[PDB]
Design a protein around this ligand. Sequence first.
Ligand SMILES: NCCCCc1ccccc1
Ligand SMILES: [Ca+2]
Length: 223
Amino acid sequence: IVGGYTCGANTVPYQVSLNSGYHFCGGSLINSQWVVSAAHCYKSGIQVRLGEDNINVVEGNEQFISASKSIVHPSYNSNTLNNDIMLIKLKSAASLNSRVASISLPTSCASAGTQCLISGWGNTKSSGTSYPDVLKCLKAPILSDSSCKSAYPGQITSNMFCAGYLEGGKDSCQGDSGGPVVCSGKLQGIVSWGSGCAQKNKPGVYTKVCNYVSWIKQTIASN
Ligand SMILES: NCCCCc1ccccc1
Ligand SMILES: [Ca+2]
């Protein structure tokens, strides 16, 4: 996250870190046994780390649970990043509390102008690299469809939305992928892609979770 603030330990209780020996992607806890993330984050051998603030220090609220199954969206396209979403089932159910909590799925798509919270442990520099060890937070509005398609001609599908600031300086960045965009207590987006980070007229692009709610429900009802 570039140009954000430190969230504070366990103030984003649905935020997970996907670890394969190191943090590589964020994700979101949607019930005690399932996590949603970006399909471009797919890996074999994922351990899900819940209750994290400092990912390099064991602080006392963590739950490390291995993944038993990963399901990438049936129409994920890695070239266009259309349908960049996947589900991860945990080997055992997480123990839910005020610091490890699931986030609700949406019943409605959020509108342009809605302010949202984006969070992750990704790069905090638009030029150069510095990875935080504690969770970073950013409040950003959903941008209109037409400003989004104007920023990325011929690349925005109906399963994508832009969110952020057209004059740059504030954005999600690498390592934030798979992470949550939460608007009014509902998961609305997944950190998916962009052109660099925090660049002028190149806002973050997010997977539109409201389009996927019935595939999510049906898939967790069956696996
Ligand atoms: N601008 C969008 C921010 C999304 C993440 C990102 C990180 C590194 C390279 C491209 C996009
Ligand atoms: Ca920790």
